[PDB]
A paper describes a structure:
Here, we carried out a structural and functional characterization of the TOSV cap-snatching endonuclease, an N terminal domain of the viral polymerase (L protein) that provides capped 3′OH primers for transcription. We report TOSV endonuclease crystal structures in the apo form, in complex with a di-ketoacid inhibitor (DPBA) and in an intermediate state of inhibitor release, showing details on substrate binding and active site dynamics. The active site of the TOSV EN is defined by the H-D-PD-E-K motif, and maintains the canonical configuration observed in other His+ cap-snatching ENs.
The structure of the TOSV EN with DPBA shows the inhibitor binding through chelation of two Mn2+ in the active site of each molecule in the asu. The anomalous signal from the two metal ions is detected for both sites with similar intensities. The Mn2+ ion occupancies in the structure are of 1 and 0.72 for positions Mn1 and Mn2 respectively. Mn2 is octahedrally coordinated by the central D113 and two water molecules, in addition to D90 in the flexible loop, which swings into the active site and becomes ordered relative to the apo structure. Upon DPBA binding the number of bound sulphate ions is also reduced relative to the apo structure, thus suggesting a lower affinity for sulphate ions. Only SO4− is present in molB and no density is observed for SO42+ and SO43+ sulphate ions in molA and molB.
Numbering used by the authors: 2 to 205
């Protein structure tokens, strides 16, 4: 029995912390070689993690990164943020039930994460990437906010919601999380490697 579930009710509202621009500081860091291995189910990326220095950026990458067939088209997105979410996409209805007397499209939207805490707070997290610059990253983040703001606001009448975004570009991150330099660098480092592996997968 969990006592933190027995607290008075929090304010039921939508909270959005402001977006901030972060710059990567990956200053000439080893990037691991890779070989794309044919598998029964999708591919497995054989990545030479032994080439990396202990604790350098990229230390969250696994020696063998499985990419099942069903996750292939979102590889760039999912490899980039794979150290933060095992998987992505959870439907609103799975956490809130149907909002109104009748279901509608907002019940079946699925941001990359919907996290419910014992204290009764819900965190909605959306990841996105861009091949553009920091200005393109800020625009992609604002587009994800606009995509989910209505569903979050309506469901905030049930449990309070905080909506977080991470948008990655080649040289940094736009996010309303409060990220360290090392956390920014991990996201960017994985995105940069993901871009490389993608140029190969698309040719194959
Ligand atoms: O674009 C993103 O940032 C997504 O997180 C997309 C996503 O979930 C998805 C799922 C199924 C089909 C197309 C996109
Ligand atoms: Mn998604
Ligand atoms: Mn996403």
């Amino acid at each position: 029995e969990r006592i933190l579930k027995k607290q008075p009710a929090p304010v039921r509202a939508l909270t959005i912390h402001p977006l901030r621009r972060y710059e990567s500081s990956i200053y000439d860091t080893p990037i691991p070689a890779y070989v794309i291995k044919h598998s029964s189910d999708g591919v497995t990326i054989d990545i030479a993690t032994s080439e990396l220095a202990d604790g350098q950026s990229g230390s969250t990458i696994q020696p063998f990164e499985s990419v099942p067939a069903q996750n292939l088209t979102l590889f760039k997105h999912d490899f980039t943020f794979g150290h933060l979410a095992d998987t992505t996409d959870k439907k609103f209805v799975e956490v809130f039930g149907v909002l109104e007397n009748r279901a509608d499209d907002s019940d079946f939207q699925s941001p990359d994460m919907i996290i419910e805490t014992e204290t009764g707070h819900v965190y909605v997290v959306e990841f996105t990437t861009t091949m553009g610059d920091a200005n393109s990253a800020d625009l992609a983040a604002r587009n994800k906010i606009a995509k989910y703001e209505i569903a979050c606001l309506d469901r905030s009448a049930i449990k309070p919601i905080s909506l977080y975004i991470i948008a990655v570009h080649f040289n940094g991150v736009v996010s309303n999380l409060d990220l360290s330099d090392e956390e920014v660098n991990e996201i960017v480092f994985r995105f940069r490697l993901a871009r490389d592996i993608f140029e190969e997968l698309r040719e194959i």
